[PDB]
C-alpha cells in the first residue's frame, strides 16, 4: 500500500524507458468514471502534441508533474512542480490549471504588502474575553538553486538542511534546531520527535501519505527534515516538508498584527542570509503544489464557538456560518477524538488570489467581528 | 511567446540600437527569483566594464553569446558561442563558466589519444552473458573557417553542407547522405524524414526547441541540415544541428574499442578531406555550448544490475555504487528517466576534464570489471 513516485512512474514508460502517452491517456480515461482532477481536465490532445515535441528530459519531467494526479483517485488538482522553472517551462499546461483553481480573471497578478499595523486588529475590540487567543500565521517558501521537494535526492536534502542550519545558527534569533537526519549533530531521539509532535511543533512522518509518496515529496525519509524552534516557542521553521520551508509564528495574545510582525522578523532573518525565494512574476511564491502559490500565506486563530458548534456537536453549522462570512472553520476536537464542548476551531480567511498579506490580515479581523456577533447572538 | 534570436535580442538594445548593459542586468536580476544560470552568476561588474570598452560589433556578439540565457529561465549555462574565436576574444567572461561547469582546477589542459586497442576491452572477459551489449558513443565537432551554427546564415549552412556531402562521397566509408535542404539532390520528404526520426537516426525539428530558437541554432530551418548513415547503420554523422557535426556509433557487441575505432575512422576520413576541427589550446574541442567542450565525447553501455538496483526499486543504491568506482548510472530514457525492472541502466564514465579518450575508455572498461563484480557479489 505504498505508491512511491520511483515505482509508479514506470507504469507510464514504454520498453525503451521513454514516456508512453498512450498509457497516460488510458489512465486519465479510467479516472473519468471516478473523479476528474484539473490535471485530467486540462490534459488535451494539443498539450500531448506539444509535450511530444519537447526534449526527452522535459517529457520525463512532465510525467513527474502529473504522477500524483495519475496515481491518486481522490486528486482535485494532481500537479507537483519539480523545479522553480517548471511554472515557465510547462506554463502552456500549468497556467489554465492555476487560473481555474485560484479563479484568476484578467490581468491579476500577486502583489505583496507586509506593512501591517500593530494595535489595530485587536481582538478585545470584539470581546473582552479575547485577551489571550492562539494567533497563527505561516508562509511556505522554496529557495532558488534547489529542486522542489518533489524532486530532491538524499544528497540535495542534506545539502539544503546544512545550508538552513547555518542560516538559523547565524540569523540572530535565539533558538534550537532539531534534525531527523541520522548522523546530524542536532539528531533528535525517537522519544524527542514524538514528544515535539505531541506538543504540536513537529510535522508527521510524510511516508504515510500516498499523495506525498507518489509525487516524491516523502522520498529519502527522514533525510534532510527537521525543525528550528525559537527560545520563546513563538517562531518555528519546518525544514524539508512539502515545501522546503514552512515559516511559522504562533503568538498567545489579541493583536493579529503582532503575529504578522513576528512572522516578518523570522522571514527577514532568513532573507538577510542572501538566499532568494522562488517567485513567479505573475503567480507569486513558487510552491510544489500550485494550490499554495501566490503568498504561500495561511493565517488563523483558535476561537471558541460553543453556541454555533452546539458545544462541539455540530461542526457543520459552525463551518456553514464561517463560510457565509468568507471564513473557513476547522474544529480541533477533544483529546482521543472526544467532543470539545468549548467548540474550539481554527478560523482562517478565504481571500481572492493576488491580494496582499496585509489584506489577508484585515479580512480575517473583519470576518471575526461578524462571526463573534453571530456566536454571541445564538 | 517570442523566442527567435533576431526578435528577443532587440529587448536588450537602447534607443540608438546599441547593447544596453542596464537592460541585461535588469533581466539577470529578475531571473534571480527563479534560477541563476552560469551566464548570470559570472556576469560580474569587471566583465561589464571590459565589454563596455569593446567595439559595437563585439558588444552585439556578446549579447548573442548570452541571449539564450537571458530568454530561457530553465538555462543551466545559457551560453552559445557564435564562432570558434569567441573562446579567445570573450575568454575573460567564458573561462570561469567553463571552469565551474567542468570542475577544472589548476593548469589542466585537454589532451587527446585515439590509440585505443581493439580486442582488449571485451565485456565477455567480465561475464560470458555480455556477448551482445548496447554500446553507444558520440563526438561533436566544428570546422575551422566556419561560424558556429548559432550564427551561420542560410548561405553558410548550404556551403557547409555542400562541403560535407563531398567529404562523404569521397572518404572511403560506404553510406548514404539524406538532406532536409529543399532542392538538394539527396533531399528527403517529411515522411521519409519522420521515419528516420522514428528509427532514432535523424535529429529533431530544432524549431520546436526554445533554446535553439533563442540562440540562432534553429535559424533558416531546415536549410543545410542532414544525416549521413553507414550501410550497416551502426554509424552516422548529423550535419548542421547544434554543432556542425555529431558523429554517432551504436553497436550491439562486446568490444568498447571497436566503438572508438568507428568514431576514429569517421574523424580521420573527415580530416583526410582537408578539414581541421576547431580546438582551444586549454579547453579542447570547441562546441556551441561550453558544456560539450574538451573531448566533445559521450560514451555509455546499457547493462543489467538487478541486484544493485533491487529489480529497479533502488536506483539510488546502483547510482551510489557506480559513483564510488568512477561511473555514472542513469535510467535507459536519458536524464531524469528510470532503471527498468531487469535493472537496465545507462552506465558512463564519470567526467574528469582533460583526460584523453584512450584513458576514459580504459577507465570505463576497468570500472565495469568492478561494477559487475559488485553486482554478482550483492
* Residue of A370, A332, A330, A325 whose CA lies nearest to A351: A325
- The alpha carbon dihedral of A71, A72, A73, A77 has a sign of negative
The nearest alpha carbon in chain B to A14 belongs to B333
Query: What span, in angstroms and rounded, lies between the C-alpha atoms of A77 and B258?
Result: 51
Residue A207, CB half-sphere, CA atoms under 13 Å: how many?
8
Query: What span, in angstroms and rounded, lies between the C-alpha atoms of A236 and A201?
Result: 8
DSSP secondary structure code for residue A123 in this structure: G
**Is B302 marked as a binding-site residue?**
yes
Which residues in A lie closer than 8 A to residue B27 (C-beta atoms)?
none
Asked if A16 lies within 8 A of B332 by C-beta distance, the reply is yes
Which residues in A lie closer than 8 A to residue B34 (C-beta atoms)?
84-85, 88, 144, 278-280, 286
Q: Give the closest of B34, B74, B333 to A17, CB-based.
A: B333
Residue A132, chain B, CB below 8 Å: the answer is no
The answer to whether residues B131 and B124 touch, using CB atoms and an 8 Å cutoff, is yes
Q: Cα-flanking dihedrals φ and ψ of residue B300, to 5°? A: -160, 165
Residue B376, CB half-sphere, CA atoms under 13 Å: how many?
9
> How would you classify residue A84: left for phi > 0, otherwise alpha for psi between -120 and 50, otherwise beta?
alpha
Q: Cell 463551518 maps to which residue? A: A319
Got the DSSP string for A25-93?
HHHHHHHTTT---HHHHH--HHHHHHHHTS-HHHHHHHHHHHHHHHH-TT-SS----SSTTHHHHTHHH
Asked if B337 lies within 8 A of A56 by C-beta distance, the reply is yes
A257-289 b/e with 16+ CB inside 10 Å = b?
Answer: bbbbbbbbbbbebbeeeebebbbbeebbbbbbb
The nearest alpha carbon in chain B to A276 belongs to B33
CA distances from B264 to B133, B160, B297 (A): 20, 21, 12
The nearest alpha carbon in chain A to B71 belongs to A88
The CA-CA-CA angle for residues A257, A261, A262, to 5°, reads 120
Query: What span, in angstroms and rounded, lies between the C-alpha atoms of A139 and A342?
Result: 29
3-state secondary structure of A177: strand
Query: What span, in angstroms and rounded, lies between the C-alpha atoms of B166 and B240?
Result: 15
**Is B299 marked as a binding-site residue?**
yes
H, E, C per residue of chain B: CCCCHHHHHHHHECCCCCECHHHHHHHHHHHCCCCCCHHHHCCCHHHHHHHHCCCHHHHHHHHHHHHHHHHCCCCCCCCCCCCCCHHHHCHHHHHHHHHHHHCCCCCCCCCCCCCCCCCCCEHHHCCCCCCCEEEEEEEEECECCCCCCCCCCHHHHHHHHHHHHHHHHHCCCCEEEEECCCCCCCECCHHHHHHHHHCCCCCCCHHHCHHHHHHCCCCCCCCCCEEEEECCCCEEEEECCCCCEEEEEEEEECEHHHHHHHHHHHHHHHHHCCCCECEECCCEECCCCHHHCECCEEEEEEEECCCCCCCCCCHHHHHHHHHHCCEEEECCCCCCCCCCCCCEEEEEECCCCCCCHHHHHHHHHHHHHHHHHHHHHC
Residue A7, chain B, CB below 8 Å: the answer is yes
Query: What span, in angstroms and rounded, lies between the C-alpha atoms of A294 and B232?
Result: 57
Asked if A60 lies within 8 A of B333 by C-beta distance, the reply is yes
Asked if B73 lies within 8 A of A57 by C-beta distance, the reply is no
Closest-CA distance of chain A to residue B344, Å? 10
Query: What span, in angstroms and rounded, lies between the C-alpha atoms of B171 and B178?
Result: 16
The answer to whether residues A12 and A27 touch, using CB atoms and an 8 Å cutoff, is yes
Which residues in A lie closer than 8 A to residue B1 (C-beta atoms)?
none
Residue B344, chain A, CB below 8 Å: the answer is yes
DSSP secondary structure code for residue A216 in this structure: S
Query: What span, in angstroms and rounded, lies between the C-alpha atoms of A92 and A70?
Result: 19
Residues whose CB is less than 8 angstroms from the CB of residue B105 and which lie 6 or more positions away in sequence, other chains included: none
DSSP secondary structure code for residue A19 in this structure: B
Closest-CA distance of chain B to residue A257, Å? 27
Which residues in A lie closer than 8 A to residue B332 (C-beta atoms)?
16-17
Query: What span, in angstroms and rounded, lies between the C-alpha atoms of B8 and A235?
Result: 45
Q: Cα-flanking dihedrals φ and ψ of residue A216, to 5°? A: 90, -5
Query: What span, in angstroms and rounded, lies between the C-alpha atoms of B93 and B24?
Result: 15
* Residue of B315, B334, B321 whose CA lies nearest to B376: B321
* Residue of A279, A283, A278 whose CA lies nearest to A108: A283
CA distances from A325 to A224, A329, A373, B104 (A): 41, 11, 11, 62
Q: Give which of A14, A51, A64, A85 to mutate to test B binding, by max B Cβ within 10 Å.
A: A85
Which residues in A lie closer than 8 A to residue B337 (C-beta atoms)?
13, 17-18, 56, 60
Closest-CA distance of chain B to residue A161, Å? 19
A12-31 b/e with 16+ CB inside 10 Å = b?
Answer: bbeeebbbebeebeebbeeb
The answer to whether residues A260 and A137 touch, using CB atoms and an 8 Å cutoff, is yes
Query: What span, in angstroms and rounded, lies between the C-alpha atoms of A53 and A55?
Result: 7
> How would you classify residue B106: left for phi > 0, otherwise alpha for psi between -120 and 50, otherwise beta?
left
DSSP secondary structure code for residue A214 in this structure: H
Query: What span, in angstroms and rounded, lies between the C-alpha atoms of A220 and B316?
Result: 10
Closest-CA distance of chain A to residue B339, Å? 8
Cell of B220: 533558416
Query: What span, in angstroms and rounded, lies between the C-alpha atoms of B317 and A153?
Result: 12
The answer to whether residues A282 and A94 touch, using CB atoms and an 8 Å cutoff, is no
Query: What span, in angstroms and rounded, lies between the C-alpha atoms of A310 and A210?
Result: 35
Residue A157, chain B, CB below 8 Å: the answer is no
**Is B126 marked as a binding-site residue?**
no
Domains in chain A, CATH or no CATH each: 5-102 (1.10.135.10), 133-377 (3.30.590.10)
Cβ-based neighbour number of residue B231 at 10 Å: 10
The answer to whether residues B368 and B123 touch, using CB atoms and an 8 Å cutoff, is yes
Residue A85, chain B, CB below 8 Å: the answer is yes
Which residues in B lie closer than 8 A to residue A16 (C-beta atoms)?
332-333
Which residues in A lie closer than 8 A to residue B209 (C-beta atoms)?
55
This structure's resolution (Å) is 2.0
Q: Cα-flanking dihedrals φ and ψ of residue B160, to 5°? A: -60, -50
Q: Cα-flanking dihedrals φ and ψ of residue B253, to 5°? A: -175, -155
The answer to whether residues B240 and B149 touch, using CB atoms and an 8 Å cutoff, is yes
Q: Give the closest of B34, B204, B312 to A88, CB-based.
A: B34
Helix axes A56-71, A45-52, angle to 10 degrees: 140
The nearest alpha carbon in chain B to A279 belongs to B33
CA distances from A218 to A37, A86, A152, B169 (A): 21, 20, 10, 57
Query: What span, in angstroms and rounded, lies between the C-alpha atoms of A294 and A140?
Result: 10
Residues 188-207 of B with CB under 8 A from A: 204-205
Query: What span, in angstroms and rounded, lies between the C-alpha atoms of A313 and A316?
Result: 9
* Residue of A264, A237, A263 whose CA lies nearest to A176: A237
Q: How many interface pairs between A and B have CB atoms less than 8 angstroms apart?
A: 79
Cis preceding linkage at A222, omega within 30: yes
Asked if B74 lies within 8 A of A83 by C-beta distance, the reply is yes
Residue B209, chain A, CB below 8 Å: the answer is yes
Query: What span, in angstroms and rounded, lies between the C-alpha atoms of A110 and A311?
Result: 40
The nearest alpha carbon in chain B to A89 belongs to B74
Q: Where are the alpha helices (DSSP H) in chain A?
A: 5-8, 21-31, 38-42, 45-52, 56-71, 86-89, 91-101, 154-170, 190-198, 210-214, 256-271, 315-324, 357-377
Asked if B334 lies within 8 A of A57 by C-beta distance, the reply is yes
Query: What span, in angstroms and rounded, lies between the C-alpha atoms of A272 and B141?
Result: 46
Query: What span, in angstroms and rounded, lies between the C-alpha atoms of A161 and B96?
Result: 28
3-state secondary structure of A367: helix
Find the largest Cα–Cα distance for chain B: 70
The answer to whether residues B195 and B187 touch, using CB atoms and an 8 Å cutoff, is no
- The alpha carbon dihedral of B237, B239, B242, B245 has a sign of positive
Which residues in A lie closer than 8 A to residue B35 (C-beta atoms)?
83-85, 144-145
Got the DSSP string for A276-305?
-B-EETTTEE--SSGGG-BS-EEEEEEEE-
Q: Starting from the edge strand earliest in sequence, which strands make up the sheet with A175-179, in order?
A: A175-179, A226-230, A235-239, A245-253, A133-141, A297-304, A344-349, A327-331
Residue B100, chain A, CB below 8 Å: the answer is no
Technique of determination: X-ray
**Is A197 marked as a binding-site residue?**
no
Q: Cα-flanking dihedrals φ and ψ of residue B298, to 5°? A: -125, 140
Which residues in B lie closer than 8 A to residue A271 (C-beta atoms)?
none
Q: Give which of B37, B328, B337, B346 to mutate to test A binding, by max A Cβ within 10 Å.
A: B337
B336-358 b/e with 16+ CB inside 10 Å = b?
Answer: bbbbbeebbbbbbbeeebbbbbb
3-state secondary structure of A141: strand
Find the largest Cα–Cα distance for chain A: 69
> How would you classify residue A119: left for phi > 0, otherwise alpha for psi between -120 and 50, otherwise beta?
left
Q: Cα-flanking dihedrals φ and ψ of residue B176, to 5°? A: -120, 140
Query: What span, in angstroms and rounded, lies between the C-alpha atoms of B340 and A11?
Result: 11
A83-117 b/e with 16+ CB inside 10 Å = b?
Answer: bbbbbbbbeebbbebbbebbebeeebebeeeeebe
The answer to whether residues B276 and B289 touch, using CB atoms and an 8 Å cutoff, is no
Which residues in B lie closer than 8 A to residue A61 (C-beta atoms)?
336
Cell of B85: 574565436
- The alpha carbon dihedral of A272, A274, A277, A281 has a sign of positive
* Residue of A65, A42, A54, A48 whose CA lies nearest to A215: A65
The answer to whether residues A179 and A161 touch, using CB atoms and an 8 Å cutoff, is yes
Size (chain B), residues: 378
* Residue of A98, A4, A5 whose CA lies nearest to A60: A5
Cell of B325: 568506482
3-state secondary structure of A346: strand
Which residues in B lie closer than 8 A to residue A280 (C-beta atoms)?
33-34
Amino acid at each position: 500500500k505504498i505508491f512511491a513516485k520511483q515505482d509508479v512512474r514506470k507504469l507510464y514508460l514504454d520498453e525503451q524507458g521513454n514516456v508512453d502517452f498512450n498509457k497516460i491517456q488510458a489512465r486519465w480515461d479510467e479516472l473519468k468514471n471516478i473523479k476528474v482532477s484539473l490535471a485530467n481536465k486540462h490534459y488535451t490532445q494539443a498539450v500531448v502534441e506539444k509535450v511530444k515535441t519537447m526534449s526527452a528530459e522535459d517529457q520525463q519531467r512532465f510525467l513527474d508533474i502529473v504522477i500524483a494526479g495519475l496515481t491518486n483517485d481522490d486528486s482535485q488538482v494532481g500537479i507537483s512542480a519539480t523545479r522553480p522553472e517548471d511554472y515557465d517551462v510547462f506554463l502552456f499546461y500549468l497556467e489554465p490549471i492555476i487560473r481555474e483553481y485560484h479563479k484568476i480573471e484578467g490581468e491579476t497578478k500577486q502583489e505583496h504588502d507586509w506593512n501591517i499595523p500593530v494595535g489595530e486588529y485587536v481582538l478585545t475590540k470584539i470581546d473582552p474575553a479575547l485577551e489571550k487567543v492562539s494567533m497563527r500565521a505561516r508562509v511556505a517558501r522554496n529557495v532558488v538553486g534547489y529542486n522542489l521537494p518533489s524532486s530532491m535526492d538524499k544528497d540535495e536534502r542534506i545539502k539544503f538542511e546544512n545550508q538552513m542550519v547555518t542560516v538559523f545558527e547565524n540569523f540572530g534569533i535565539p533558538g534550537n534546531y532539531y534534525s531527523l537526519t541520522p548522523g546530524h549533530k542536532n539528531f533528535i531521539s525517537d522519544q524527542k520527535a514524538d514528544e515535539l509532535r505531541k506538543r504540536h511543533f513537529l510535522f508527521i512522518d510524510m511516508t504515510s501519505d500516498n499523495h506525498l509518496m507518489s509525487n516524491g515529496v516523502a522520498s529519502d525519509w527522514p533525510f534532510g527534515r527537521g525543525i528550528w524552534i525559537s527560545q520563546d516557542e513563538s517562531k518555528m521553521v519546518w525544514v524539508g516538508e512539502e515545501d522546503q520551508l514552512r515559516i511559522i509564528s504562533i503568538v498567545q495574545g489579541n493583536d493579529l498584527g503582532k503575529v504578522d510582525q513576528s512572522l516578518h522578523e523570522l522571514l527577514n532573518g532568513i532573507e538577510k542570509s542572501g538566499l532568494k525565494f522562488a517567485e513567479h512574476p505573475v503567480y507569486g511564491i513558487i510552491t510544489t503544489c500550485p494550490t499554495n502559490m501566490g503568498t504561500g500565506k495561511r493565517q488563523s486563530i483558535l476561537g471558541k464557538f460553543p453556541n454555533l458548534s452546539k458545544a462541539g456537536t455540530d461542526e457543520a453549522n459552525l463551518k456553514d456560518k464561517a463560510k457565509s462570512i468568507g471564513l473557513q472553520a476547522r474544529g480541533i476536537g477533544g483529546e482521543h477524538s472526544s467532543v470539545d464542548q468549548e467548540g474550539t476551531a481554527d478560523i482562517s480567511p478565504s481571500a481572492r488570489f493576488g491580494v496582499t498579506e496585509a489584506i489577508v490580515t484585515k479580512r480575517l479581523f473583519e470576518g471575526l467581528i461578524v462571526l463573534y456577533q453571530i456566536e454571541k447572538t445564538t
